[PDB]
Ligand binder design. Structure first.
Ligand code: LMN
Ligand code: LMN
Ligand code: PC1
Ligand code: PC1
Ligand code: PC1
Ligand code: 3PE
Ligand code: 3PE
Ligand code: 3PE
Ligand code: 3PE
Ligand code: 3PE
Ligand code: 3PE
Lengths: 494, 75, 68, 670, 101
């Protein structure tokens, strides 16, 4: 039983215990929440054990278990540098997501925990599978649990939201499936170790690129294909929102490393000016739009759109710096956007019952712990240094500028507007007068739970912001394998 | 109002009405001269302009280790 | 929609349910409420845009005349 | 010692801010002041250790960012320039911490205020001690965040909220240009560490240096309030007065000046950026000085006065002589920390009020407060044989020393700005101390004159001066504004001084103009600024309290009214900014949310499909009548269509068009 | 020369940095070839890191005289900056080239 298969098995045992413990003890709801939390903790503990044993400079997939009982659809698991940190981010985030809803579900708690635990197994399976069809099977398997999570525990407009996220993702994924099936037909197999060895013809690469890019653009999302995010990420329960923004957005980013950079390098090189136009447009249009967004979670949801454009531009830079920056920005956005949704969807929305920004003012006066963390998360969302958000933005933007300067400059302008919308929101909530006259009751400050799910998130971004080498050390050799090009005097040694 | 009891707010009817109008605004969009031009400016022209500049200047320069007597122009 | 005016043009000596933003509790609000209140870009009203550009040209011409 | 100068303000800021409950108000003041003073003393030693004996000290701790070619380390490097700028930074910070012991005595947030002041000092020290451009930019963003938190310190005030966003966003524009500039360094040189950029500077493409050089000048433009991005510094006067003195008048505004001075071994090889350095600095001198003459706020006049001194440094940078700019940056910092802190006494003296049109008397009520201004004022207007004389009255001479059209023209511009400099200098001095009492009688009511009968112990408020803590920095800064300029003029000017042979600053031999400055310049132009200074003072002093109505006659003409407002409205570079830049973006965001996101992209997307397909779905179902006779007809017609298509060898495109038509008609009701 | 450490024994490429003579069917040898491509590129680039490092110490040690004394160290970095860059194996794996063309 490989460590990687252990990762997928623990959350399934937790589901079993959650749904059977009543036959051994009316069981208290606190029991279910404790089973689910410990389950995610042991999954985090296993992912940390794997990371200690992980080797930073191996071109072999590590911790793979030999199957040799070949079938039509077999599940092979393996990990290298590009997948190791996405696996860690999934295992760190999900316990925080569980605590972020400890008190705010209050109904169908068994269903919420089983759905949350199942989502962990599926999302981890996405980052661990060593086959392109296996990748697709898990990328899509999460829609029905996502569809039912929003509908069971979402806000007032959760019906329109759940439909939007289901149908957008399916429609785009159906175009990715067509591209994937063409690959398996030509090659005979979708296993990574032998599909990357193959060489597709240019026009095949061109049509393979559109099919895959249409799906990755719905999931980034790119601007104009992002209606589903505006609805789903806001109407979802807080735990759903954290998982949706901090893990699910990353699948398309990790999928660019496994599905287009190795097999479609000519198409990627010849179409970067189209990816960059869409990437540049998304940086500006989203930034201007979130400046005028009045729902606090939708403002924070809309920020994810702007940052996802920056690491989408990085992965197509064909440079070592852009690709490392893209993973580091995708990781950084995972912590910071998780904290900002806890601040908005968890702290403000539980106190007031509303998310309109018009009703908030001067919260610093009564809530100095919320404002202290909120400001640090508003700095991190603005790409301020000593946050992992700056190291990722600077490396991602440097690659974008070097690959194509006109897009780099425009994507650079995000340094202004991210700051602009992040600080403007911060002032209309924490500063900007005395406590809002709409509040009749006074508000309490962060509970111990709220303090420690924020302190944990702001610790990860800051420590990684001062020493990003912890992550870059395990990306240097694997990131190198996805670069496409040669130097005049280093190529073809004899 | 929600599942978990919150504090008592002075829920202003005017602000509540404003936040509902925004959430429902998509149902009332119509194609007119104005709405067609704006939607054509943002979606087609400005993106196609950037795509033109990105396409035209892809590979035009390299800054790496450039010296005096050696240009930045690459094409 | 009410006529959209920056709330700074309200008077600060009126019976205001909220003095800081100079609004009664349930006043009808313009759909641009978010960018019409006190916390917002200040609307300077010393001169009108056409006349102001003329005055700047005088300084540039004077600056240009000094250089010549 | 070298690394203790780094962490000591940091530790002082962490304890005061995160444990203000534990140490209390006085505990915080004891730590921040002690940590800054101990740090300040060590810098004085470092000036001897590094500047005087010429030992640059390299300290590298651990790697920050390591990707292939980029190896950015948390490395610090002490040379002549960083210890030059560490002296005023630590000295005034020591004096501002001490000064704030009294100014904030009634503030209910003393621990937070002192925590911020020590964090800014830490961020300033990081900015100048770094040995690479990226780690420097951390302090660059660091002082910017500390500036934002100290402007918005009174966060319940809506107008100070707008100021901090102006401080944050205007500077962020500069950092975008600066970030792009480091990209161009990284792209061309592999890394952005100082010893690499300057080792390869004479050898890289001249066009590259222009691309490089322009970028950081725009970044330098934002953090030193140049005519383009200049609107944050006077708006940034909404914070407490020591913050205005420390961050917005003597230390951070000098970060843009520091960036060009450290980059001197690189920008020297680009006359295009250097020429842009000259005129840009020249422009902001008349721009700032003119506006300052027509400001009613004491702090707002001073803000315009800082912008002028920085503009002369930017001017001096264009003259290929960065040492004089370094000479003026240290010299300007002391006279300025003097002017503002003493000014803060004036606001503290009367009512927490700062409007000129209600100030008067106070010459005897605040004797010491008046005295420090006069020393500061003459140092600012470069009175002969004072601290500002050796710096301000050497930049102007250096400009004539370079015998060119650009050098002579900026002289005329700077002199006019220097002419208008003394007028607001006179306005500050006269309207607050040497004029008739324009404030209420409450300010001027001494117990010596019998006014009240019963409430004699109280209800006097005779505009008293400050305590020891308020006057000790005032006295100390006075000496620096008299003797420090003369004492150090040989280190920074000399004739062939070797204080920068460690290459910290770099001057190319072809760009040297200093020899002509001492000899070729004519005596008349050398003493010309003094002639205008000692003359135009008397007209300003005669235009008030002697004539006092020539100006109002000019004011109420139509020509004067338009000029007065234009200069009072700061050239209108904020009305077109607010309306044609800021609100343009706000309307662009409005259009995108309302027309596209909540608009066309929903209609030409999911919402349109939902509308149409429900319509299309309902019409097709209406053909399902359950009339068995009608169904038989449908089967026959489908039978006939299949026979036509296969028997007649129909083009497939005919079939698809027919289906599209059948959807079209079905899409139409009835 | 610096002795080869025990760590720099388990990761030495037993194969030359090339794809000529590699049977792409055989997985071990292709993977070794890709390993040799990347490691050579990284080895060549850390040369620039050490040269950059030395030039830094030279620059400070020489002060103003850096423009005249650190010349050899200047050029060596510039040559490395011109040539060394991790470009991956993927192009060379997929595209054969010959000098006798
Ligand atoms: C955004 C949709 C992208 C979906 C990805 C499809 C997966 C790849 C199929 C693209 C396709 C047709 C595309 C027709 C128009 C595309 C959709 C039109 C607009 C969609 C609303 C390329 O079709 C062309 O492929 C060229 C070869 O590459 C041939 O030369 C052409 O003759 C051929 O027509 C099929 O060709 C492919 O089939 C495989 C056999 O498994 C063959 O090996 C190749 O032949 C391969 O290329
Ligand atoms: C923030 C920057 C602040 C502003 C500073 C600008 C400072 C000046 C830089 C301008 C620059 C830097 C690239 C900028 C972006 C690169 C990275 C971006 C920033 C990285 C962070 C962009 O210059 C580009 O402009 C293009 C305009 O189309 C031209 O491309 C082409 O245009 C048409 C053919 O010329 C084609 O038909 C068209 O197909 C191409 O498109 C080219 O001129 C060039 O590629 C390079 O300018 C330099 O280019 C060279 C060749 O000209 C010039 O050398 C000259 O050549 C001989 C005949 O020329 C002269 O006899 C000789 O005397 C001299 O040797 C220079 O004199 C100078 O001009
Ligand atoms: C982020 C929370 C982590 C746990 C919290 C407790 C630690 C928080 C950090 C406190 C300061 C720790 C650094 C102190 C430095 C003092 C010197 C020192 O101890 O160095 C010893 C070591 C370094 O020793 P070394 O550099 O001398 O050599 C050994 C390391 N190798 C050989 C690999 C180079 O520092 C550490 O181990 C600190 C590790 C801190 C956290 C490491 C990564 C945490 C995040 C993992 C997930 C990342 C992906 C997420 C998605
Ligand atoms: C370049 C991109 C500039 C992007 C500007 C818009 C960014 C978002 C701003 C949203 C408004 C937030 C706000 O509080 O507005 C009030 C703030 C406050 O401005 P204010 O001047 O109206 O505040 C008035 C202060 N009193 C009351 C004392 C008069 O507006 C800003 O200053 C925000 C920064 C604008 C930066 C403008 C840079 C122009 C550079 C032009 C050359 C390049
Ligand atoms: C390939 C890249 C994109 C290219 C196209 C670019 C445009 C984007 C197109 C996205 C299509 C997929 C998202 C559709 C989501 C709409 C869901 C919806 O209608 O709300 C559900 C709504 C929820 O909103 P509601 O509850 O507020 O209103 C409906 C009320 N009832 C339920 C009573 C009808 O509920 C429904 O189920 C009603 C659906 C009726 C039929 C709708 C069909 C829409 C799907 C068409 C797919 C066409 C694909 C071609
Ligand atoms: C793994 C082995 C067990 C690890 C859990 C050890 C920590 C622990 O003791 O948890 C106890 C947990 C709740 O504590 P308890 O006292 O039973 O509840 C009282 C509420 N009034 O009691 C529980 O019910 C927790 C059950 C956890 C089951 C193991 C984790 C599930 C995933 C398995 C893989
Ligand atoms: C690695 C490959 C894995 C392949 C799949 C292996 C199995 C994965 C899980 C599939 C479904 C397992 C369901 C586990 C729960 C079953 C036990 C149970 O009865 O839970 C009941 C629970 C609460 O209901 P109850 O407590 O009885 O009522 C109380 C009312 N006060 O009620 C619930 O829990 C219902 C929870 C909501 C429904 C689940 C989430 C949506 C699932 C959509 C199903 C279709 C897609 C299946 C996808 C499988 C994973 C990809
Ligand atoms: C904050 C101060 C951290 C302590 C500074 C010195 C740490 C140290 O002794 O080195 C540990 C390790 C080695 O440093 P390294 O980056 O590998 O290269 C240095 C070249 N000799 O480098 C490290 O691992 C330092 C890790 C620091 C992690 C961030 C700590 C944040 C604390 C808040
Ligand atoms: C100096 C060159 C001035 C050229 C003459 C300009 C002039 O005199 O225009 C007349 C205008 C009078 O002011 P106005 O408000 O229009 O009076 C209306 C009364 N029915 O007065 C003005 O508009 C003069 C505007 C002066 C401010 C220009 C900016 C400063 C220029 C400094 C030189
Ligand atoms: C997807 C690309 C376009 C997305 C949005 C398309 C759109 O604009 O939808 C509007 C259209 C008509 O809707 P409309 O009747 O105007 O509004 C209902 C009034 N009650 O909505 C429609 O229903 C247009 C018809 C769509 C038909 C799709 C047919 C798919 C199968 C084609 C088979 C060809 C062989
Ligand atoms: C099917 C939608 C296309 C309908 C085309 C049409 O108008 O044909 C008429 C017939 C329905 O007749 P209708 O006009 O609705 O009168 C009903 C009164 N009870 O429409 C029909 O239902 C004919 C059914 C056969 C359609 C075969 C279509 C083949 C497409 C290739």
């Amino acid at each position: 039983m490989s460590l990687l298969y252990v990762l997928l098995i623990i959350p399934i045992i937790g589901i079993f215990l959650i749904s059977t413990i009543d036959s051994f003890y009316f069981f208290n709801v606190s029991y279910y929440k404790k089973i689910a939390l410990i389950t995610t903790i042991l999954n985090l503990i296993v992912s940390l054990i794997i990371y200690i044993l992980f080797d930073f400079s191996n071109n072999q997939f590590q911790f793979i278990q030999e199957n040799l009982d070949l079938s039509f659809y077999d599940i092979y698991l393996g990990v290298d540098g590009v997948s190791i940190y996405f696996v860690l981010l999934t295992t760190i985030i999900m316990p925080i997501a569980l605590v972020s809803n400890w008190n705010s579900i209050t109904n169908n708690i068994k269903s919420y925990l089983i759905i949350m635990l199942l989502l962990e197994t599926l999302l981890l399976a996405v980052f661990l599978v060593l086959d392109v069809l296996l990748f697709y099977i898990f990328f899509e398997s999460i829609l029905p649990p996502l569809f039912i999570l929003i509908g069971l525990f979402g806000s007032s407009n959760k019906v329109r939201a759940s439909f939007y996220i289901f149908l957008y993702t399916l429609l785009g994924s159906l175009f990715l499936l067509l591209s994937i099936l063409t690959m398996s037909s030509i090659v005979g197999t979708t296993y990574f170790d032998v599909l990357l060895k193959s060489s597709f013809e240019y026009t095949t690469q061109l049509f393979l690129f559109f099919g895959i890019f249409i799906a990755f653009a719905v999931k980034t999302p790119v601007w104009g294909l992002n209606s589903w995010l505006l609805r789903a990420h806001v109407e979802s329960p807080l735990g759903g929102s954290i998982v949706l923004a901090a893990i699910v957005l990353k699948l398309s980013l990790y999928g660019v490393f496994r599905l287009i950079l190795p097999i479609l390098p000519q198409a990627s090189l010849n179409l970067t000016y189209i990816v960059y136009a869409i990437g540049a447009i998304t940086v500006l249009y989203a930034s201007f739009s979130t400046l005028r967004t009045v729902d606090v979670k939708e403002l924070i949801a809309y920020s994810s759109v702007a940052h996802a454009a920056i690491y989408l531009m990085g992965v197509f830079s064909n440079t070592i710096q852009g690709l490392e920056g893209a993973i580091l920005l995708g990781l950084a956005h995972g912590f910071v956007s998780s904290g900002l949704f806890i601040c908005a969807g968890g702290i403000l929305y539980d106190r007031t019952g509303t998310r309109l920004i018009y009703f908030f003012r001067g919260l610093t006066q009564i809530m100095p712990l919320f404002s202290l963390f909120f400001f640090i998360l508003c700095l991190g969302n603005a790409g301020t240094p000593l946050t992992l958000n700056f190291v990722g933005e600077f490396m991602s933007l440097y690659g974008t500028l070097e690959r194509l300067p006109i897009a780099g400059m425009l994507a650079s302008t995000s340094i202004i507007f991210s700051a602009a919308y992040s600080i403007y929101m911060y002032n209309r909530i924490a500063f900007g007068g005395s406590v809002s006259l709409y509040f009749i009751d006074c508000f309490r400050d962060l509970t111990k739970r709220e303090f420690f799910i924020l302190f944990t998130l702001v610790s990860f971004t800051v420590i990684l912001g001062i020493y990003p080498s912890f992550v870059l050390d395990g990306l240097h050799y694997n990131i190198s394998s996805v670069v496409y090009g040669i130097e005049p005097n280093a190529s073809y040694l004899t | 109002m929600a599942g978990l009891q919150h504090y008592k707010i002075a829920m202003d009817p005017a602000l509540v009405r404003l936040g509902s109008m925004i959430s429902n605004r998509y149902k009332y969009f119509r194609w007119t001269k104005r709405t067609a031009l704006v939607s054509f400016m943002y979606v087609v022209v400005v993106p196609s302009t950037i795509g033109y500049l990105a396409y035209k200047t892809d590979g035009l320069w390299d800054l790496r280790a450039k010296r005096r007597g050696d240009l930045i122009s690459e094409r | 929609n009410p006529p959209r005016i920056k709330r700074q043009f309200r008077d600060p000596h009126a019976d205001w349910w909220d003095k800081q933003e100079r609004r009664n509790f349930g006043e009808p609000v313009h759909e641009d409420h978010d960018i019409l209140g006190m916390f917002s870009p200040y609307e300077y009203t010393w001169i009108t845009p056409g006349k102001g550009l003329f005055q700047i040209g005088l300084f540039i011409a004077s600056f240009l005349g000094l250089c010549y | 010692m070298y690394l203790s100068i780094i962490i000591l303000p940091l530790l002082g800021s962490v304890v005061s801010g995160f444990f203000g409950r534990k140490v209390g108000v006085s505990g915080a003041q004891l730590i921040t002041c002690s940590s800054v003073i101990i740090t300040t003393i060590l810098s004085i030693i470092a000036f001897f250790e590094v500047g005087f004996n010429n030992i640059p000290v390299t300290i590298n701790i651990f790697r920050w960012i390591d990707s292939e070619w980029f190896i950015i380390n948390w490395g610090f490097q002490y040379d002549s320039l960083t210890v030059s700028m560490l002296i005023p930074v630590l000295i005034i910070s020591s004096l501002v911490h001490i000064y704030s012991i009294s100014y904030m005595s009634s503030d209910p947030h003393n621990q937070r205020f002192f925590s911020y002041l020590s964090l800014f000092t830490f961020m300033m020290i990081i900015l100048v001690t770094a040995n690479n451009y990226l780690l420097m930019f951390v302090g660059w963003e660091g002082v910017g965040v500390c500036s934002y938190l100290l402007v918005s310190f009174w966060f319940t005030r809506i107008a100070a909220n707008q100021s901090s966003i102006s401080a944050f966003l205007t500077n962020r524009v500069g950092d975008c240009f600066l970030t792009v500039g480091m990209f161009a360094i990284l792209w061309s040189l592999g890394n952005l560490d100082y010893a690499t950029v300057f080792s390869l500077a004479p050898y890289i493409n001249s066009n590259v240096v222009i691309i490089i050089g322009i970028c950081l000048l725009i970044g330098a433009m934002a953090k030193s309030s140049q005519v383009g991005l200049h609107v944050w510094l006077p708006m940034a006067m909404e914070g407490p007065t020591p913050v205005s003195a420390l961050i917005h008048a003597a230390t951070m505004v000098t970060a843009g000046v520091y960036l060009l001075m450290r980059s001197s071994p690189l920008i020297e090889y680009s006359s295009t950026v250097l020429l842009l350095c000259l005129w840009l600095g020249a422009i902001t001198t008349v721009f700032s000085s003119l506006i300052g003459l027509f400001q009613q706020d004491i702090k707002k006049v001073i803000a315009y006065s800082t912008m002028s001194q920085l503009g002369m440094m930017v001017l001096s940078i264009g003259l290929s002589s960065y040492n004089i700019a370094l000479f003026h940056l240290v010299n300007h910092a002391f006279y300025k920390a003097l002017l503002f802190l003493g000014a803060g006494s004036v606001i503290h003296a009367v009512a927490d009020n700062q409007d000129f049109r209600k100030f008067g008397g106070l010459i005897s009520y605040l004797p010491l407060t008046y005295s420090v201004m006069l020393i500061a004022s003459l140092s600012l207007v470069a009175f002969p044989f004072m601290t500002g004389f050796y710096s301000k009255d050497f930049i102007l001479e250096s400009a004539y020393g370079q015998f060119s059209f650009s050098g002579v023209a900026v002289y005329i511009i700077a002199t006019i700005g220097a002419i208008f400099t003394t007028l607001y200098s006179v306005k500050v001095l006269y309207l607050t101390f040497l004029s008739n009492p324009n404030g209420p009688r409450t300010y001027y009511r001494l117990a010596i004159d019998n006014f009240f009968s019963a409430q004699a112990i109280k209800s006097y408020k005779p505009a008293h001066e400050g305590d020891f803590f308020l006057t000790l920095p005032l006295v100390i800064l006075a000496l620096f504004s008299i003797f420090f300029g003369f004492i150090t003029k040989d280190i920074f000017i000399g004739l062939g001084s070797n204080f920068f042979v460690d290459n910290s600053l770099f001057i190319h031999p072809i760009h040297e103009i200093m020899i002509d400055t001492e000899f070729a310049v004519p005596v008349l132009f050398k003493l010309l600024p003094f002639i205008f200074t000692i003359s135009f003072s008397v007209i300003a002093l005669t235009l008030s309290e002697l004539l006092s109505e020539l100006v109002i006659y000019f004011k109420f003409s139509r020509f004067g009214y338009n000029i007065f407002g234009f200069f009072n409205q700061r050239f209108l570079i904020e009305f077109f900014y607010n309306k044609y830049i800021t609100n343009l973006i706000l309307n662009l965001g409005g259009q995108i949310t309302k027309i596209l996101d909540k608009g066309s992209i929903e209609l030409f997307g999911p919402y349109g499909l939902e509308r149409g397909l429900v319509k299309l779905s309902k019409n097709i179902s209406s053909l399902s009548t359950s009339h068995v006779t009608t169904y038989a007809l449908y089967i026959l017609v489908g039978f006939i269509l299949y026979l036509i298509y296969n028997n007649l060898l129909l083009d497939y495109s005919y079939l698809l068009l027919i289906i599209i038509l059948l959807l079209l008609l079905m899409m139409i009701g009835e | 020369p610096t002795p080869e450490s025990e760590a720099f024994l388990a990761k030495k490429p037993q194969v030359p940095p090339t794809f000529d003579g590699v049977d792409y069917e055989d997985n071990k040898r292709l993977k070794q070839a890709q390993d040799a491509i990347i490691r050579e590129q990284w080895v060549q680039v850390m040369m620039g890191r050490l040269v950059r490092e030395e030039l830094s110490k030279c620059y400070y040690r020489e002060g103003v005289n850096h423009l005249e004394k650190c010349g050899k160290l200047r050029e060596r970095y510039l040559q490395l900056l011109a040539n060394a860059k991790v470009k991956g194996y993927l192009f060379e794996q997929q595209n054969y080239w010959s000098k006798e063309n």
